[PDB]
Design a protein around this ligand. Sequence first.
Ligand SMILES: [Ca+2]
Ligand SMILES: [Ca+2]
Ligand SMILES: [Ca+2]
Ligand SMILES: [Ca+2]
Lengths: 15, 146
Amino acid sequence: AFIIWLARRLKKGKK
Amino acid sequence: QLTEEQIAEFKEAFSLFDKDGDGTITTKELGTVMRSLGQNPTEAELQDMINEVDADGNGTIDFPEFLTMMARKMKDTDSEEEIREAFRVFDKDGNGYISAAELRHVMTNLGEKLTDEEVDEMIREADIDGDGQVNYEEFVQMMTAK
Ligand SMILES: [Ca+2]
Ligand SMILES: [Ca+2]
Ligand SMILES: [Ca+2]
Ligand SMILES: [Ca+2]
């Protein structure tokens, strides 16, 4: 599921 | 320590994964996404993973459960099994090299829309030689980062 976090990590930076 | 930003991320991320938006994650939903990664795991592997993440084993994973799962994958990110599974899943072509197109396709297939920049940041930062591709060795090292 780490995949979900992977996106959140980059997505969090975008925000 | 859950910050407002982190909570908002779950709401947006969770809403993205949950098509119906019932506030619950089913096997068909996660399974479909988990398969889109170019992988074809059996229900046993999926169900087993869910059970390990489902503190109550109700057959579905709630937002709270996801948070716990993250702590495991984030804390145990140094697990050979977790890394091996991620490496194989990421490298759908099994070329042993992770590209921006492949990564973007994976991280995106997560019901999220990431720009070429985001993916580039992950690879660019993971690419020690800046060859535009991340090798297993570089992946393992980047899989231990907090
Ligand atoms: Ca749902
Ligand atoms: Ca549950
Ligand atoms: Ca590949
Ligand atoms: Ca490299």
